């Protein structure tokens, strides 16, 4: 059926929790990204058929956050929009959903991606409507409940990472080493300009004037192995997962224009990459960090490739323990993986994260002249999503 | 392109706000409906390839509510699931998304539909995370914010209904006469058993015994025109929209098994209807209730049909004002519209509503032997979505 291409790929900088982007709602991050993605694609906003955006922490954001980003971007009100929640997978799944809708014959141009502002998540009173009646209750952190807590096992995602570390014997030192390598690669990438083509600046209009945020602030420049080794376990006693070898709580939007190859040609667009195949898979929730293994194999099976064939891989770093397990099992050449750093350094804005690694992948492919790329990531609740790209000449 | 069929269509009863389903989470409503939809389709849980469910009031429901419903229904962990938010359209749009994925070649059997428990929606504190510092603040009703408030114009959905009453010159009396006829049709339908096939019971098992809910709670039997005429306006001074000519706040889940025709044949399934075509469209948010006009026209054009060819129509009754505007402009034969009553009587459980009308439409097409059917509904934020069905021989 129809061939599907990426026309443009843009993201905001990734803000740290409570920091640079704390005053910028997710839908405004999304709007910023959508407007620049349409500009970079060289198409008219009236060319767009649908908007499909990932967002996990929807609480109190108002009706249909994807529609709000679309409106705030200046897209025509006649364009339909919907918000997707697949937890960590959400922003990458909207890209394969776009490809599906285009393959189905129903659209030619779709805005896809994700947006999250974890800094802005509310607290909840679940029984305020009809009453608590008597006794103390929980004032619930919505970011943890909706984003970070396994709904079946009643523990944090971090415990799923410990579960993998324990089953696979991925040691603290192996996790810390992996974290250090991610940090060094992010520092090198930031300072050498690797992210300039993909980052749209966010212009913040405060009281005392305008501020511009255009750089990823989560990396820890000058990280050392001894500094990593001093940290304490974050999730259990004598555990292996720490704040230094797990990603953060972060804010970002990442948006792509997805088109049929035929429409792209008709509109004079020069695509960045072809979407060759994709997949999604479920796993036991207790080992969610493993979901990429099954999503990636299904997708590769469709592509007719092998892992050795891949020139660049983005495999998300929610936790070193999970990235290492997926890497061992799929036998990745680690030199081709997260070549500009990964989420331990860069951050993990949940609803945007999978879109964010895809933006990073397609730019890196364009700059290094790589042919075959893979983007894949784990999903809270025990899933995975993967997309395979082939560069356009 | 693969043909796509509805294998089964099941819903819970529609509960009134704070009443019969107040103690049943949306995901448990969803799991009840999934389990019965799978049974009715005559398939096995392992035949399901993906779960895609609408849910609007996601706040504090935990990671990926669709995934939770799937797991609770006894579907395998390996199955991917995602939660869709298109406000009122959510539960209908997952069905057309299911069709699109099957058409794209990526699945044969998908659980679709929606779930909502408005009674259970939390209250929010938006600045509890970093602090209020000083001064009173808003304790935010999440049901209103995320479900019922226009994000662009900063007023209730009820004001958009008033806007349509004014611009289409639809009187208070016209709205009331419409409401009364819905109430009468619902009463007659309920008492003659029209919904008995489609409704799956919900068993509420507390500490001390069990209660069965299997009937729609919201209808006001013995409604009168004088009873309606006396009501106060709900949304503005001297308004035309009231509690009597607007739908309610309600709890429900509605689920369909969606399959390719070839898979249904292989598995021995006797499908209820073919999905012929579908459409989504945007409109000014200020008149969101007109959304179905454009969505319906798109879907009819794509099907190669006409409005006059339709045998049964489900056009959602979010407000009489909007239902009447849509019916006038599409020139519906009103004896074919909402023949078992509509949402003014039955309720509007936002995330499920779209799926609920489709369930009602397919059962009514079976019972009345009607060949061509339309389901369509308005969407807060200025959208509409529609699906066209053709009965299976």
Author numbering:
A (entry chain B), B (entry chain A): 1 to 393
Task: Copy the relevant paper text.
To further investigate the role of the redox state on the structural properties of CaTHL, the crystal structure of the reduced form of CaTHL was also determined using the C378S mutant CaTHL, a protein that cannot form a disulfide bond. The active state configuration of the reduced form of CaTHL was similar to that of ZrTHL, in which the two cysteine residues involved in the disulfide bond formation in the oxidized form positioned apart with a distance of ∼6.4 Å. The catalytic cysteine loop in the reduced form of CaTHL moved back to the active site by ∼8 Å. Accordingly, the flexible region was found to be highly ordered, forming the native sheet–turn–helix conformation as observed in ZrTHL. In the reduced form of CaTHL, the positions of two catalytic cysteine residues and the conformation of the catalytic cysteine loop were restored, resulting in an active form of the enzyme.
Here, we present the crystal structure of C. acetobutylicum thiolase (CaTHL), a type II biosynthetic thiolase that catalyses the first step of n-butanol biosynthesis and condenses two acetyl-CoAs to acetoacetyl-CoA. CaTHL consists of three domains: an N-terminal α/β domain (N-domain, residues 1–119 and 249–269), a loop domain (L-domain, residues 120–248), and a C-terminal α/β domain (C-domain, residues 270–392). The N- and C-domains form a typical five-layered fold (α–β–α–β–α) observed in other thiolase superfamily of proteins including peroxisomal degradative thiolase from Saccharomyces cerevisiae, β-ketoacyl synthase II from E. coli, and the biosynthetic thiolase from Zoogloea ramigera (ZrTHL)14151617181920.
